Amino acid sequence: QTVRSVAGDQRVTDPVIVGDNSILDYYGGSNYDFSNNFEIGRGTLYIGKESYFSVPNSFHLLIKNTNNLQNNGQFIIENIKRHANQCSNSSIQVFPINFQNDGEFEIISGGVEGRCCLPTSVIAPQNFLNNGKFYYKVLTDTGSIYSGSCMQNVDIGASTTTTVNNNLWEFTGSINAQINGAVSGAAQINLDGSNMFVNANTFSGQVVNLINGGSFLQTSDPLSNIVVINGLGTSDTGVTSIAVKGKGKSFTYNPSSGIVKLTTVEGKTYAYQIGCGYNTKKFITNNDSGASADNFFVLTYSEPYSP
Numbered sequence: 001q002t003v004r005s006v007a008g009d010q011r012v013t014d015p016v017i018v019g020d021n022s023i024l025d026y027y028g029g030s031n032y033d034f035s036n037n038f039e040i041g042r043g044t045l046y047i048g049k050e051s052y053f054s055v056p057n058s059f060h061l062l063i064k065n066t067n068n069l070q071n072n073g074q075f076i077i078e079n080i081k082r083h084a085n086q087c088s089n090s091s092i093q094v095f096p097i098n099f100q101n102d103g104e105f106e107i108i109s110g111g112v113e114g115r116c117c118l119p120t121s122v123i124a125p126q127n128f129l130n131n132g133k134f135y136y137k138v139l140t141d142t143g144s145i146y147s148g149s150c151m152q153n154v155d156i157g158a159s160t161t162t163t164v165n166n167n168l169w170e171f172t173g174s175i176n177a178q179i180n181g182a183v184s185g186a187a188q189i190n191l192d193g194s195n196m197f198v199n200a201n202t203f204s205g206q207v208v209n210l211i212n213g214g215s216f217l218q219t220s221d222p223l224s225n226i227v228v229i230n231g232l233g234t235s236d237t238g239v240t241s242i243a244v245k246g247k248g249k250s251f252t253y254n255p256s257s258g259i260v261k262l263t264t265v266e267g268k269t270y271a272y273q274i275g276c277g278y279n280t281k282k283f284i285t286n287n288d289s290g291a292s293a294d295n296f297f298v299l300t301y302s303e304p305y306s307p
């Protein structure tokens with residue numbers, strides 16, 4: 001049992017080592033820069049605005065030139081705007097070469113009441129391997145889920161990075177998760193009120209679960225694979241949706257396979273496994289036309305989701 005609790009800005013060039021039953025609490029700094037390896041055992045590494053045990057305007061975390069980030073415990077990044085309401089260039093940038101997450105990796109932002117001013121967030125290790133739980137949550141000052149109009153944009157992966165999910169991702173609240181790199185494995189992605197944008201050409205082995213008005217959007221051309229998407233439906237906790245880039249010509253649902261196909265006027269056909277027991281007559285289809293894809297063909301279903 002060792003607690004370390006360190007206040008103020010940090011430029012850390014030494015290895016970060018958290019032993020079993022230990023806590024390392026970095027807080028109260030506006031600037032954090034780590035450049036060496038991380039080894040987190042059965043303990044907690046916390047980097048945040050306020051102490052793990054509970055004020056600058058800004059929060060900047062950079063992990064860059066780190067060879068290996070090995071997480072076997074809890075790795076928390078927390079940036080809640082409390083009293084503060086100034087708009088700053090707050091950022092979370094996680095670019096280690098190797099990130100192996102066997103435990104819990106949890107990013108928490110939000111607390112925006114007035115001006116819509118959220119941090120830049122990019123999680124793009126060259127090699128990001130998740131065997132554990134990756135959480136991104138947007139919370140109020142009290143720690144409730146934030147579901148307002150100020151959307152936290154999160155970039156996951158990049159054009160040349162490799163991302164593997166073998167367990168769980170869960171994005172909760174007003175989050176736009178832009179999947180900008182190759183993702184593979186065999187895992188669940190839980191979208192609890194959040195949107196996920198499949199921008200890449202490899203997005204494989206991921207079962208997507210839409211909860212509380214969560215949405216799946218693809219901007220890339222149709223994949224080889226048929227993504228399993230659970231939760232299409234309309235309830236009091238909202239309307240979940242599947243959307244593809246372009247202008248929709250038609251849809252077909254096969255009640256015998258549980259596969260829906262969305263065909264665009266360009267003749268691109270997107271296929272998703274939504275499950276059995278849908279009624280064709282209760283599907284709704286809309287072309288959205290505006291501003292990343294200008295246009296989306298949006299599939300919804302008028303009745304509650306039944307597993």
Ligand SMILES: [Gd]
Pocket residue numbers: 013014
């Ligand atoms: Gd040193």
Ligand SMILES: [Gd]
Pocket residue numbers: none
């Ligand atoms: Gd030991």
Ligand SMILES: [Gd]
Pocket residue numbers: none
């Ligand atoms: Gd040791």
Ligand SMILES: [Gd]
Pocket residue numbers: 020041
């Ligand atoms: Gd140990």
Ligand SMILES: [Gd]
Pocket residue numbers: 020
């Ligand atoms: Gd030990």
Ligand SMILES: [Gd]
Pocket residue numbers: none
């Ligand atoms: Gd040991």
Ligand SMILES: [Gd]
Pocket residue numbers: 009029030031056
């Ligand atoms: Gd500072």
Ligand SMILES: [Gd]
Pocket residue numbers: 039
């Ligand atoms: Gd070790």
Ligand SMILES: [Gd]
Pocket residue numbers: none
């Ligand atoms: Gd060791």
Ligand SMILES: [Gd]
Pocket residue numbers: 041
């Ligand atoms: Gd060890």
Ligand SMILES: [Gd]
Pocket residue numbers: 041
């Ligand atoms: Gd150990």
Ligand SMILES: [Gd]
Pocket residue numbers: 050051052054078
């Ligand atoms: Gd906190």
Ligand SMILES: [Gd]
Pocket residue numbers: 074104
């Ligand atoms: Gd936790």
Ligand SMILES: [Gd]
Pocket residue numbers: 081082083084111112113141
């Ligand atoms: Gd706040």
Ligand SMILES: [Gd]
Pocket residue numbers: 081082083113141
């Ligand atoms: Gd506040």
Ligand SMILES: [Gd]
Pocket residue numbers: 102131132
């Ligand atoms: Gd594991």
